[PDB]
Amino acid sequence: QGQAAARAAAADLAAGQDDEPRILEAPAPDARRVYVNDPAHFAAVTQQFVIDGEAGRVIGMIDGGFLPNPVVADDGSFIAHASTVFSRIARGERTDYVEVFDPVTLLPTADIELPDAPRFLVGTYPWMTSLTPDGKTLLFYQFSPAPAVGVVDLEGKAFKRMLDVPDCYHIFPTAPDTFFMHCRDGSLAKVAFGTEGTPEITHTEVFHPEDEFLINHPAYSQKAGRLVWPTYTGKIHQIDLSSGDAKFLPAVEALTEAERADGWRPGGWQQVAYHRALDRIYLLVDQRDEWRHKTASRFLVVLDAKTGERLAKFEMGHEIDSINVSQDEKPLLYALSTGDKTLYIHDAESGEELRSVNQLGHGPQVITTADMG
Amino acid sequence: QGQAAARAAAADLAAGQDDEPRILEAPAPDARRVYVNDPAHFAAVTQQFVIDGEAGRVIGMIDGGFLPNPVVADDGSFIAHASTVFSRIARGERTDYVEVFDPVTLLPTADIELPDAPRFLVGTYPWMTSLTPDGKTLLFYQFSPAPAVGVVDLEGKAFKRMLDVPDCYHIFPTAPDTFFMHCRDGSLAKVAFGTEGTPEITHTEVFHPEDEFLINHPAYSQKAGRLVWPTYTGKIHQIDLSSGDAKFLPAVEALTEAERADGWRPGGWQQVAYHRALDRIYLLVDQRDEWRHKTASRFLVVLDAKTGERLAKFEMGHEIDSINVSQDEKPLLYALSTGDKTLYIHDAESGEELRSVNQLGHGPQVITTADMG
Amino acid sequence: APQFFNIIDGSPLNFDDAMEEGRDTEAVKHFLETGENVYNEDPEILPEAEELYAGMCSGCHGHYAEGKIGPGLNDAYWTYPGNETDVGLFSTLYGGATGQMGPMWGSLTLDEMLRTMAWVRHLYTGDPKDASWLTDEQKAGFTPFQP
Amino acid sequence: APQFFNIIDGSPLNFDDAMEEGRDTEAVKHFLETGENVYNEDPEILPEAEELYAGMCSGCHGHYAEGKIGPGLNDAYWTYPGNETDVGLFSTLYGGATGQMGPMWGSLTLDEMLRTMAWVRHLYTGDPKDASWLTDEQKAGFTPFQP
Amino acid sequence: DKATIPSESPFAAAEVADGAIVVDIAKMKYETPELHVKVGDTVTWINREAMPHNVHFVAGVLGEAALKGPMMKKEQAYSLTFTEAGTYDYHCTPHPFMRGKVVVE
Amino acid sequence: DKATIPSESPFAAAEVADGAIVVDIAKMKYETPELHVKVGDTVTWINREAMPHNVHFVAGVLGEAALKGPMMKKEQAYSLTFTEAGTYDYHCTPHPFMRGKVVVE
Amino acid sequence: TDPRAKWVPQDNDIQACDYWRHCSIDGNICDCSGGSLTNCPPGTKLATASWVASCYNPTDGQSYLIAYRDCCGYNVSGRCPCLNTEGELPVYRPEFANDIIWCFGAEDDAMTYHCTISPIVGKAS
Amino acid sequence: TDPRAKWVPQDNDIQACDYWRHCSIDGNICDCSGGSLTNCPPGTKLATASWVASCYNPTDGQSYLIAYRDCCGYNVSGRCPCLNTEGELPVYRPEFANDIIWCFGAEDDAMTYHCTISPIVGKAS
C-alpha cells in the first residue's frame, strides 16, 4: 500500500532506479476477487471497482452507462455487462449493448448492440441478466412492452432473439437452454428454448401466498442448483433446480421468535448470501418497522441451510446494505455500506472486520464474486 | 420553498384541487440569475445549475460532457457551451460540439459539431471560450497541435474556421472581428479576422516581467472594455480595451503592506470579480504560503478600481474558492465553496451572508452572471 | 327497492313468462320471498350448476367467468351495481341486459337460474368481505376460486 | 589547459596565418596573454561589432544569433563546451568548427574577431550568472538582449 | 392508420354516450378482454378504479407508430374508432400483465 | 511515407554516430531551427536538458499519420531519415511554442 | 432521524423526505431542481407511467393515492434524495414497486431519471 | 492539515497527498485504483506528454524532476484526490501548469482523465 510502496519507492531511488512507465495487468482471477458496482444513484454513467478482497486493494476498474447489469463468469474467463449510453449524455439516441472484457487486461473483447433498446432500467438486480452455465449465452430481461428475455450469443458475438415469456421476472439458468423465472401468480416458470419457434414453458405450483413478499435480491448458487429466496419477514424459501426441476425444500425461519417478537426483520439491498461448500445462509437484519425494508442493517445472521440452525449472529458495527461471500474454504463476508461507499471485509467464521476499501464511487450497492473452478 | 409550498400544497387539497402535471418554464432571465458549473473533478459528464440568486432557488439545470466551457449572452437571449462526449462514456469516438439553449425552456436550439475534436481540455477557465459582443460568434481556444482559435457562427449555426494565432492564451473579444490574447512573452496580441486569409495580429508591449505570474482567472467586463488581471501577490494589472487598443492603466496593490508582511496572498479558483457600474474589484484572499495559490480562502477584499482605495474586507466564514457578482445597482457577492458544494450569496456592500444553495454537484467551481441590458 | 325490475328497462320482471316446470322448489320459494339464494355454496347443487354454466354461459363469459366476448363475472366490479346481490343477479338473467345477453326465462326454469347463479358466485376470486351474498358460515368456508 | 587549440581538431591554432593588419592592439595583446576580451560590453566597440556580425554571421545564425541554418549562439548551451569562455569562442572562430562553419582568419583581423565576439556576447538572453565571460561590473550593467 | 383518436385527452365517465361500446377497467384488468365490434365502431375504455391505467397498442398495430394512450384516472374515459377490420392487441403501459384485444370484423 | 523511423525508442546520447547531423534541444528550444539536409540523411535530435521533450510532425507531413516521437529525457536521442525532399515542420507535443523545420533538398 | 424507525409524515415542508406525499418515493424531489410538487423542471420530459403509493395525510387524516411519475431525459439532479418504501412491493408486483425507472411514455423516448414528482391521483383510505 | 500552510513532504506513504513525489499533482493518485507509483491501471492509456515539477525528497535531501503523466481513457477514479501546486505556473507557461489534461500521445487518442502517475525523469536541485 503506501508505506510499503514508499519504503520500496524511496529505496529504489537510493539504489539508483529510474522509472519506465507502463500500463499494468491485473493479477489472474482468483476466489478472493470481489466486484463492487456503483449505480451512483441513477446517474447516467457508473463505475465497477475490481478489488482483491484478500489484500483489500482496488486492482482495476470498468466504466459503464446508465444502470448496467454486471455479470462475472464463475470460472474467471471474462466479465461482462449489459449497458445503456446516449449520444448527448442523458438524452439523444439510445444504444443498449453488451460488452465483454478480458479479466487480466480489462480491455473490451466484444461490444454487441442490442436492437431497439430493450434493456430494463431498474435499480440493479443481479439476477435480471444472467449467464447460462457453459458461459456462451447471456440472457436479459425486458419488461415493456411485454415480458421477454433476450438471448445474446457471447461466442459468435451477436444478439440472437427475444423470447416471449409470461408475466414472470428474474432469470435463473440451469442449463444451456433452460432457465426459471418467478411469476406474478406465485409460481416459477421453466423456459426451455432452442425450441426455435417459441420456447417450451412449464409452471411449477404456487409456492408462497399472495401476501408473502419475496425479495428482489434472491441469492442463486448456479453450481449447486440452489435458490435461497427470503421474504420481508426473514422466512427463507429454498428451491433446488439441480435435477432440472424445481423441488421445494422446507422453509426455514431466519429470525428467532424472540427477535420477531422484538421487531427484527431483514433490510437492505443484497440482503442474503449463500456459501455453497459450507452450505450456509447469511442474512442482513436489524430492528425496523415493517415498511423500512430497503434500509441498511447492522447485524448478520448465519444459519445452517439444511436445518435452519442459527450458527452465529455478527455485530457488524457499520450500516451495511449488501452482503456476499467468497466461495472458497475459508471465506470472507463482504459487507458494503452504500452510505460509507466502503467495503468492509469480515471473517465469515467469526464476523471480525479484517480490512475496508473506502471511496467506492458515489452510491455502491452490488457485490459479485465468482464461484471458482 | 418547502413550508411555503406545503401550506400551499396542503390547502390546495383542503380547497379540493387535483394536480395536472406539466413541464415548467424558467422565469425570464434577470440580473439575479446566477449559473454554477460543476466540472465534478474531471468526471466525464458534468452539470450546470441555473439559480435565482435572489430567492436562492435552483430554477433549472443543463447537462454537459467532459470539461465544458459555459458561455452566457449578456443580454439573456441564450446560454451555450462547447462540450465533449464519447461513444462509450469515456473512450470511443470523440465528438466536440457547441450547443445553444433557450433560457426560459432550457431546450437545445442548435447543436454544432466542431470537426476533428479541437477543444482544449483544461480545468475550466471562463475566458477560453468567448462570445463576440453582438452574440453571433463563439470563439474557442485550441492548444495542440498549435495555438488556434476556432470561430463558430452561432447565427447560421456552423463552424467556420480555425485561426492560426501565436503562442498566446485566453480570448477577450472587443468587437465582432477582433479579440485579444495574453502571450507567453508578456504582451497582449490583438487579432482582427474577417481578414479572410490570415487574421491581422498586433502586439502590445510587454506589460509584466517574466517572474510576475498572472492568474488563469482574470475578470473581463466586456461592456466596459476592462480587464482586471491579478498576480500571485494580489498586484492588480488593469487593461482598458474600450478604444480598440490596449491602454495599460496603473497597477494597484490589493493587499496592504501589513497584510503582505503578515503573509496574505490571493488564493482560489475564480479569485477576482469586477462590478462595472460601481467600478469595483473584489479579491479572494487569506494567509498562505507562497505556493498554495489554488486553495480556498476565507476573506474578501473590496477596493476602488480607479484609486486602489480599500473599501472593505469581508469575513466570509466559509472556505470560498470562487467569487463573482451580479451587475446591477445593489449587487450580491456570490461565494462558491467547492468543498461545501454550496453557493453562499452575500450582500456585496456589507458582506453579510443572506442565503445559501447547497448540493451543487460534486465539485462546483465556476459562477457566471450576465451583465444585463 | 321492491324486488324485481328489468335492469336496463321495462321495469317489473314478468313472472308469467317463466316455465312452470321448475318454479315449485323451496329454493325458488325462499328466494322469491326473501331474495336469498340457498344454493350458494351448496355442495349438493354445485355439480349441476357448473354444467348449467358451461352449456349456457362460458361461450361469451369464458370457462371461469373471467371474460371473453362478454365481461368477467368473477370479481367485485359489476357493470350493473345490483349484481352484488342475488336479486340483481337474478334480474340480469331473467330480464336480460343489452345485446346478445338477452332474457333467459325461455331456456331455464327459475330453479335452474338460481343453480347457475350459485356457480357464478362460486367462481368469485375476490375475498369474503365483498361476498355480501354469502352468510357468515358460507363466508367462513369460502375459498377464492382457483383454476 | 594551455590556451589555444582547434576545437574539433588539428590542435594548436596557428597564429602565423592571421592578418598582421590588426594583431597589434591592446585588446588582442591583453586577450592573448590573459584570455580576457576587453571589448565585452564596450559601448565604444559595439556599433562596429554589430556590423561585423551582420556581414558575416547572421546568414547562418540569424539576426540576433537565435539560430537559422546553423545553431543559436544566444543562451547558455554551447555544442562545444569551451565556448562558455572567450578563449573557446575565439578558438571556434579562428580555427573553425565543421561544415560550412570554417576558419575565419582569412577574412577577419584578430581584433575584428574579438569585436564580433563581443556582439555575440551582447546578444545573450540568459541571465548574469552564466555570464562567466563578464566581470562583476560588466554583469552589473548587463541586460538580457531584447529584440 | 386503422384507428382515429377522437379526443386525445381523457374526458369524464359520465359523458360517455348513451349505450356506447364500453370496456371497463377495474381490479387490475380489462373486463371485456376480447371485444368484437364492426368496422366503424368506437370503443371507449373507462377506468373504474383509483389506480391509473391506459391502453397502449404497439407499433405496427394501429399505425406505423405505437399509440400509448393517455393515463386515465378514476372515472375517466378514452375512445378509439376502428376504421380497418382486424385483431388489435393492447396492454397497459405501467402494468403489461393487463391485456385485451379488439376484434373488428 | 517520407521518413523511415530508425529506432523507435530513444537511445542514449553517447551512442550517436561519429559526426552525425544533430539538433540539440536545450533551453526550451530546438537549437538549429531550420536544418537543411539532403535526401537520404538522418537527423538525430538529442535532448540536453532534464525537461522531457519530443519531436512531433502532424498528419500529412511525413505520412498519412502524424508522427508523435517518443519523449526523450536528458541525454537521450531519436533519429529520422528523410527519403523524400521537402520542408517538414515539427513542434514539441507538450510545449507547442517549441518549433523547428527540416529542409530536405 | 433513526432510518429504521417508523415513518412519521409531516405536512409542513415539501423538500423534506418526510413530507407526507413522499411515502414511496425513490430518487429526488423534483422541487429541489426547478420543478414544483407536481411539475417537471425546465427541459425534462414527463412520463405518463408510474408506481403508486397511499399516503396518509396527517393534516386531514385521509390516505391519498400518489402517482410517482418521473421527469426524464436528464442525468440525476443530485439534490433532495429520498427513498421511502411505504407499502412498496417487489418487482413482480410492478404497480407498487419503486426501483423501476418510471419514465415510460415520456416524449422522445426519454429514459434517464432526473427526479420524481408527487401528484395526488385520487383518495384511497 | 491547514490546506494553506506550507507543504511538508513525507517519504513514508504513497497514497497520501503529501507523499513527496506529488508536489504538483492535480487529479488522483494512480496507485489508488490499480496502478503503481509509475504505471497506469489495467485498461487505461499512458500519455507521453506531461507537466513537470521539482520535488524535494526529504529523505536524501535532493530535488527531483517529476513528469506528471496521465493515465487516460477512463472516467476519473474518484479515489486519492490531491492537488498540490509547488512551483506551478499559469497556463501561458504550459510546461509547469497542472490544470491541463496531460493525456496527449496516449494510444487511440484517449483523452479522458483517470489518474496521474509520478515517475522521476531526472534530478533538478
Ligand code: HEC
Ligand atoms: C354471449 C352471446 C352471452 C351469453 C350466452 C350470456 N351472456 Fe352474459 N353477457 C353478455 C354480454 C355481451 C354482456 C353485456 C350486456 C350489457 O348490457 O352490458 C353480458 C353481461 C352479463 C351480466 C352483467 C355483467 C355485469 O358486470 O353486471 C351478467 C350477470 C351475465 N351476463 C351473466 C351471464 C350468465 C350467468 C349467463 C349464462 C346463463 C350469460 N351471461 C350468458 C353475453 C352473453
Ligand code: HEC
Ligand atoms: C553559415 C554558412 C555560417 C557562417 C557564415 C558562420 N557560421 Fe557559425 N556555424 C555554422 C554551422 C553549420 C555551425 C555548426 C558547426 C559544428 O561543428 O557543429 C556553426 C557553429 C558555430 C559556433 C559553435 C556553436 C556552439 O554551440 O558551440 C559558433 C560559436 C559560431 N558558429 C559562431 C559564428 C560566428 C560568430 C560567425 C560570424 C563570424 C559565424 N558563426 C559564421 C554556420 C555558419
Ligand SMILES: [Cu+2]
Ligand atoms: Cu394498468
Ligand SMILES: [Cu+2]
Ligand atoms: Cu518540449
